[PDB]
Structure formats: structure tokens, C-alpha cells
Amino acid sequence: TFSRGPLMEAASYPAWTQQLIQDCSESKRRVVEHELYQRMRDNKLSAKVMRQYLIGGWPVVEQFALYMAQNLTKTRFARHPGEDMARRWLMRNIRVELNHADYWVHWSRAHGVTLEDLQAQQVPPELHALSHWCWHTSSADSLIVAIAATNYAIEGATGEWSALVCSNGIYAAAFPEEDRKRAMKWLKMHAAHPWEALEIIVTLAGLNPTKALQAELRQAICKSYDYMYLFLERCMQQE
Amino acid sequence: DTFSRTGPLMEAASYPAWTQQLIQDCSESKRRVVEHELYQRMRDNKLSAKVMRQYLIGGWPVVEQFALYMAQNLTKTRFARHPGEDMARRWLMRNIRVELNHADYWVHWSRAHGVTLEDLQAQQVPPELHALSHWCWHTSSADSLIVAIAATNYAIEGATGEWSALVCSNGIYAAAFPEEDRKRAMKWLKMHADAHPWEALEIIVTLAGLNPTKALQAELRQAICKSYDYMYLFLERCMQQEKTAVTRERLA
Ligand SMILES: CCCCCCCCCCCC(=O)O
Ligand SMILES: CCCCCCCCCCCC(=O)O
Ligand SMILES: [Fe+3]
Ligand SMILES: [Fe+3]
Numbered sequence: 001t002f003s004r005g006p007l008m009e010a011a012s013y014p015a016w017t018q019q020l021i022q023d024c025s026e027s028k029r030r031v032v033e034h035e036l037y038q039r040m041r042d043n044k045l046s047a048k049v050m051r052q053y054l055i056g057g058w059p060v061v062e063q064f065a066l067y068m069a070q071n072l073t074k075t076r077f078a079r080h081p082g083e084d085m086a087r088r089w090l091m092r093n094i095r096v097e098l099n100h101a102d103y104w105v106h107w108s109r110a111h112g113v114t115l116e117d118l119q120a121q122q123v124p125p126e127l128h129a130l131s132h133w134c135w136h137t138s139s140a141d142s143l144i145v146a147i148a149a150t151n152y153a154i155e156g157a158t159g160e161w162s163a164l165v166c167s168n169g170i171y172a173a174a175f176p177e178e179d180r181k182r183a184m185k186w187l188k189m190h191a192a193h194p195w196e197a198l199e200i201i202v203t204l205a206g207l208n209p210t211k212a213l214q215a216e217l218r219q220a221i222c223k224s225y226d227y228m229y230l231f232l233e234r235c236m237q238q239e
Numbered sequence: 240d241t242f243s244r245t246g247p248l249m250e251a252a253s254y255p256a257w258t259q260q261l262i263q264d265c266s267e268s269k270r271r272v273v274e275h276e277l278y279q280r281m282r283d284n285k286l287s288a289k290v291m292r293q294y295l296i297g298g299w300p301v302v303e304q305f306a307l308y309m310a311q312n313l314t315k316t317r318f319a320r321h322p323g324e325d326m327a328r329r330w331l332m333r334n335i336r337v338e339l340n341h342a343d344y345w346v347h348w349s350r351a352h353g354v355t356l357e358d359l360q361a362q363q364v365p366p367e368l369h370a371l372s373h374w375c376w377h378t379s380s381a382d383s384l385i386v387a388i389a390a391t392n393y394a395i396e397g398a399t400g401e402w403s404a405l406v407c408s409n410g411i412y413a414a415a416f417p418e419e420d421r422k423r424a425m426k427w428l429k430m431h432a433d434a435h436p437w438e439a440l441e442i443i444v445t446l447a448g449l450n451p452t453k454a455l456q457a458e459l460r461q462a463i464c465k466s467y468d469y470m471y472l473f474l475e476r477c478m479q480q481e482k483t484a485v486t487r488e489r490l491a
């Protein structure tokens with residue numbers, strides 16, 4: 001049984017957890033420090049690649065609350081404290097995504113990418129792998145693995161690359177004054193969820209999870225990062 | 240707009256123009272899979288131990304779960320709702336049985352290259368190799384019956400009939416196995432090296448009819464090419480490791 005130090009510090013969680021974070025650090029790093037985001041931050045990304053990024057990312061954003069809904073259907077009342085924690089967290093964070101799909105549409109519109117463009121999904125297959133993995137793990141994997149792959153890995157990495165993109169103001173400064181707030185909304189809203197997810201994962205796993213379970217979590221987390229990396233590499237192949 | 244085949248099952252000309260157009264539109268995506276360099280090298284017994292291991296481990300999930308994709312699609316059918324749905328139900332109920340022993344045959348093929356059942360289950364391969372399996376589960380789970388059959392039973396089985404035939408086409412790969420191990424090792428390849436892809440196409444055409452919307456045709460084309468393209472992604476990644484493995488020994 002595990003009960004938690006501060007929320008957003010690896011120290012507050014067990015030894016196997018800090019080792020897990022450590023084992024996933026490089027897979028995460030090459031995503032959150034990727035050249036594509038550095039160039040987006042500096043208003044240096046070509047329009048063609050920015051268009052691909054917004055289109056290719058749309059399925060994961062549009063369906064993100066649906067991944068959580070699928071995971072919610074794996075929960076049962078009072079079957080395990082972590083499960084209750086997950087149920088309550090999922091029931092609240094599905095609400096949180098209420099407008100986020102709309103914000104992505106507005107962001108995309110600011111770059112000339114229409115709703116028709118988002119729906120058409122005319123992008124390379126490297127960009128869709130992330131969405132297929134999210135649906136599969138949300139559909140077929142255990143509650144703990146699916147939360148690790150989607151809510152911990154993707155949301156955590158997304159908090160970091162969204163912050164990087166906004167870090168020096170150049171990107172936002174490129175938008176016309178009267179379009180900036182609406183265009184930057186999604187980035188702003190995403191630039192604590194990942195640590196809350198980890199807390200749920202740790203509670204579910206316990207203080208002494210088997211090596212097999214630690215390995216399953218590590219591999220699921222790194223697969224999410226690696227499909228984000230595959231996405232970004234293919235985008236930059238064009239640049 | 241009902242479809243009823245009159246020409247031979249395994250000829251494109253027996254199907255409507257839109258179907259022949261679909262085949263044409265997907266032909267280059269198919270070709271670069273079924274003619275891939277990796278299969279020419281496998282045919283000639285050239286592939287490195289590293290890549291053979293990656294190939295056999297990476298392909299396992301799609302093979303192991305193939306009848307489960309078909310099972311999931313069967314749950315989408317209802318009796319007498321559409322002639323193509325009855326055709327799909329009866330075909331799926333028959334061919335789920337066909338896969339009875341194929342996972343075992345893949346295990347036997349893998350073991351002939353030193354890949355253990357434990358190696359298959361551990362799934363220690365690059366993510367480019369797992370994309371295909373994630374796509375297969377997603378389309379089988381969430382797409383329409385017609386799209387999911389196109390993505391799995393038409394695209395993947397069709398391509399697999401042709402690359403397995405290519406690997407077996409000149410006898411070198413098989414003769415390289417020792418006498419006492421060859422039959423068991425070659426079983427999976429021989430069982431797949433075929434009416435299945437054409438039967439799947441006939442079902443797709445029956446479901447779609449003679450004048451499907453352009454939107455449905457585009458959905459089929461994109462699903463079929465996605466299956467081919469994920470096979471291509473798989474093979475490209477393998478050949479990257481092949482070039483590294485062979486170059487290392489050449490320079491050494
Ligand atoms: C690494 C590039 C991936 C493309 C961007 C996908 C962003 C998905 C963000 C999901 C989390 C959320 O929408 O709240
Ligand atoms: C490049 C393809 C990667 C290996 C995939 C294995 C082939 C899947 C075969 C599915 C059909 C069947 O098992 O009968
Ligand atoms: Fe969001
Ligand atoms: Fe979030």
C-alpha cells in the first residue's frame with residue numbers, strides 16, 4: 001500500500017518509480033528537446049511542416065477524452081484505492097478536455113489549416129502510428145498500463161514541448177495581434193496532470209511491484225515517446 | 240447496384256471498374272512491399288541473424304492475433320442484414336478455423352532461427368515494427384466491417400501470399416536448413432506461399448455494391464495503403480539494421 005512529499009517531485013515516490021522515470025528519460029528527452037519544436041518556437045518552421053504537424057496531431061487530441069472514457073470502463077467502485085483514484089481522476093479530466101478539440105481547430109485555423117483539412121488526414125503513416133497505439137492500449141491493455149501510455153507519457157511530454165514552443169515569445173509574436181489569443185489558446189492551456197497520473201500509477205502498482213510489471217510500464221511509456229519521436233522525425237524529413 | 244461475380248474469382252476483370260481502379264491506386268504501395276529487398280535477401284538466405292530475429296519477433300503479434308482480428312470483425316455482422324454481410328460472416332466463420340495451427344507454425348519457423356517462444360513473447364523490437372499490429376487492432380476494433388476486411392484480409396493476406404511465395408521461389412532459403420529441420424521450419428511459409436485475398440475482395444465488392452460513393456472508395460484505398468505502408472515501414476527498419484549488421488562484419 002502506497003500513500004504520498006510534494007506532488008511534482010520524483011523524490012516523493014518509491015525507489016522503483018524514480019528508477020522508472022530514470023529509465024524513460026532518454027526516450028522522453030529526444031521528444032521534448034526535438035529540433036522541430038526549437039524551430040517552431042523561433043518561427044522558423046516552414047508552413048508545409050506546420051500544416052502536417054497540426055493535421056497529424058489532430059486524431060490524438062480529438063480522441064483524447066475517448067481514450068480516458070475507454071479506461072474509465074475498466075474501473076470498479078471500491079475494488080482498489082488506485083482504481084477509485086483513477087475513476088475520480090478520469091471522470092474529472094474528461095470534462096477538462098471539453099473545449100480542447102475546439103482550441104486545436106482554432107490553432108490550426110490560424111495557420112490556414114481548415115476543419116476539412118483536419119478531417120481529411122492527408123499525412124504520412126508515421127504520423128498516425130501514435131493514434132493507433134493510443135487506441136490499442138486504451139482498448140486492450142490494463143488500466144495502469146493505459147494510463148501510463150496516455151495520461152503520464154503523452155500529457156507529460158506535451159506539457160514540456162508546449163512550454164518550449166512558447167518559451168521565448170517569438171512564435172506567438174508572429175500571429176496578428178487580433179488573432180493571437182484565439183490561436184495560442186491550446187498551447188497556453190497545455191504549457192500537474194502527468195504527476196497526478198503517476199500518483200495513480202504508483203498507487204495501482206504498490207510499493208513492491210514485480211519486475212515484469214515495472215518492465216511493462218517502462219515499455220509502454222517508452223513506446224508512447226518513441227511514436228512521438230517517429231512523428232517528429234518524419235515531419236522534419238520534409239523540412 | 241447489386242454485385243454478382245460471373246468471371247473467375249482470381250481475376251481483376253471479374254469486378255467493377257471502381258474495384259479495378261482501387262487495385263490500380265494501391266498497386267505501387269503493394270509493389271514496394273511484395274518486391275522488397277528484404278524478401279529478395281531472405282529468399283537467398285542472406286539476412287543477418289539480427290534481422291531474422293527482428294523480423295520473426297516483430298511479425299509475431301500480427302500472426303498470433305490474426306484470427307482475433309477476424310473474430311472482432313465477425314461481431315460486426317448480423318444475419319440477413321446485407322448479402323455481403325452474410326458472405327462475410329460465413330467466410331469469417333470458416334477461415335478463423337484455417338488459422339488454427341498457424342501461430343504454432345510461426346513458433347516453429349522462429350525456433351529454426353534460434354528465436355524462442357520467450358523471445359516472441361518479450362517483443363523486444365523497435366516501434367516501427369509494432370505499428371502494423373496496432374493498426375490491425377484499431378481497424379478491426381473501430382472501423383466498419385468493409386474497411387477492416389480490406390485492411391487485414393485483403394491487404395495483409397494478399398501481400399503475405401506474395402512475399403511468402405517470393406521467399407520460397409528459388410529453393411535457396413529452404414535448402415539452407417539441415418535436412419532434419421527443414422519441413423518443420425518451412426511449414427508456415429509453405430502454408431502461405433491463394434484464393435483468400437480474392438475471396439476477401441469479393442466480399443468487399445458485395446458490401447460496397449456497383450456504385451459506392453467516392454468517399455467510401457477513398458476510405459478503402461487509404462485503409463489498404465495504410466496496411467501496405469506499415470508493412471513497408473517494418474521492412475525499411477529491418478533493412479536499416481541489415482545494412483549495419485553486414486557492414487560491421489565486412490569492415491571487421
Ligand atoms: C510528438 C508529436 C505528436 C503530435 C501532437 C499530439 C499532441 C497530443 C496531446 C494530447 C494531450 C491533450 O490533448 O491534452
Ligand atoms: C512486413 C510484414 C511484417 C511481418 C507481418 C507478418 C505477416 C502477417 C500475416 C498475417 C496473415 C496470416 O497470419 O495468415
Ligand atoms: Fe487537452
Ligand atoms: Fe492534460
Ligand SMILES: [Fe+3]
Pocket residue numbers: 305338341431
Ligand atoms: Fe495464417
Ligand SMILES: [Fe+3]
Pocket residue numbers: 396435
Ligand atoms: Fe490467409
